[PDB]
């Protein structure tokens, strides 16, 4: 079903990186794998991703570069599942890297944070069977 080195969960196939990429670079990589950065729409999917990434900052397909927060596959953000860390997203400018924070990642407890897109975090690709 899922290709070698991909993991099946609830009619999706997932690929967990072991290296880091800036968010756009990770987004590109998933696209070229016939996939997309993971889009998380339920607790069940959130917990599955958590189990596989462990306590590691990991990009997901959620960003506010178009204006509103958007999932990379068009799934509606406002009516959808959200698991932000408390007082995230905050578009923090204090990181010194320039600009705000426009890309969501899983944090080491699974809850989400907006961070600077250039950080080389791990990422998860997802493709739907």
């Amino acid at each position: 079903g899922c290709p070698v080195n991909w993991v099946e969960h609830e009619r999706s196939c997932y690929w967990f990186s072991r290296s880091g990429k800036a968010w756009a670079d990770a987004d590109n990589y998933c696209r070229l794998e016939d996939a997309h950065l993971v889009v998380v729409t339920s607790w069940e999917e959130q917990k599955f991703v958590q189990h596989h990434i462990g306590p590691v900052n990991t990009w997901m397909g959620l960003h506010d570069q178009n204006g509103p927060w958007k999932w990379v596959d068009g799934t509606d953000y406002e009516t959808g599942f959200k698991n932000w860390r408390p007082e995230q997203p905050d578009d923090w400018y204090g990181h010194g890297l320039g600009g705000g924070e426009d890309c969501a990642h899983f944090t080491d407890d699974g809850r989400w944070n907006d961070d600077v897109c250039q950080r080389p975090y791990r990422w998860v690709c997802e493709t739907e069977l």
Partner: antibody, heavy 122, light 108 residues
Framework: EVQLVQSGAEVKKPGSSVKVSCKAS????????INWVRQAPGQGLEWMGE????????FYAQKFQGRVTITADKSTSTAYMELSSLRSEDTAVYYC???????????????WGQGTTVTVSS | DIQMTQSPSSLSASVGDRVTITCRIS??????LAWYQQKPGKAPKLLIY???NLADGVPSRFSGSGSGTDFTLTISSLQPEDFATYYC?????????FGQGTKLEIKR
């Protein structure tokens, strides 16, 4: 050993269609995209499109959209590129290429077919 | 389509020379860039991928450098079999586009 083997040269009248095949061997066909790249005589390389055989998802360069069709037959590990409404400027060598990957870094065209010469002429 | 500006378009060099070919990109593609060699009548052959990685079996005299929008292919010591046309290609989104090619010919 990975090999991509293409069908033979084709002479086509303007307005006709050509279908070029690309038989893949030596790897899991559904694990990599098959890409089509053409080269007009004396010119550079031009990407036409890609198919992912697992999903049959295709991507075409806009200038060929509505004119190129890429298909894949998982049962024979063969991909096809069909270019319709042929014109003189479609005279070219057509290559298929596997889009390989190093995990977590980048993609690349590592294995190429031998090329298929398509001459569009009346 | 992303614009790929390869320079020079033609280069004359001697066996043993260092050769450098540059590829400028119209936007940031990180390291998603490959270099190919093509000889007349042959399919292109992958030399460098992910901007700086030497492809399997390719001699180490080939090296790539750069990221973002400026990339370089270097042949540290030109060999007689290296006279060919070279292309860069991005792997950023769609459509993939190639540089216009650099033809390396023999100086005399």
């Amino acid at each position: 050993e990975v090999q991509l083997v293409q069908s033979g040269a084709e002479v086509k009248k303007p307005g006709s269609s050509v279908k070029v095949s690309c038989k893949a061997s030596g790897y899991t066909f559904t694990n990599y995209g098959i890409n089509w790249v053409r080269q007009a005589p004396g010119q550079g390389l031009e990407w036409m499109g890609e198919i992912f055989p697992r999903s049959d998802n295709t991507f075409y360069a806009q200038k060929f959209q509505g004119r190129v069709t890429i298909t894949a037959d998982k049962s024979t590990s063969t991909a096809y590129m069909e270019l319709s409404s042929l014109r003189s400027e479609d005279t070219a060598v057509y290559y298929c290429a596997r889009k390989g990957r190093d995990y977590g870094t980048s993609h690349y065209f590592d294995y190429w077919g031998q090329g298929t010469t398509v001459t569009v002429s009346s | 389509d992303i614009q790929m500006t390869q320079s020079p378009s033609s280069l004359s060099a001697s066996v043993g020379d260092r050769v450098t070919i540059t590829c400028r990109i119209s936007e940031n593609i990180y390291s998603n860039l490959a270099w190919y060699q093509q000889k007349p009548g042959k399919a292109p052959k992958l030399l460098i991928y992910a901007a700086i990685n030497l492809a399997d079996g390719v001699p180490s005299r080939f090296s790539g450098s750069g990221s973002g929008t400026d990339f370089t292919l270097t042949i540290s010591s030109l060999q007689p079999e290296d006279f060919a046309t070279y292309y860069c290609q991005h792997f950023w989104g769609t459509p993939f586009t190639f540089g216009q090619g650099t033809k390396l010919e023999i100086k005399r």
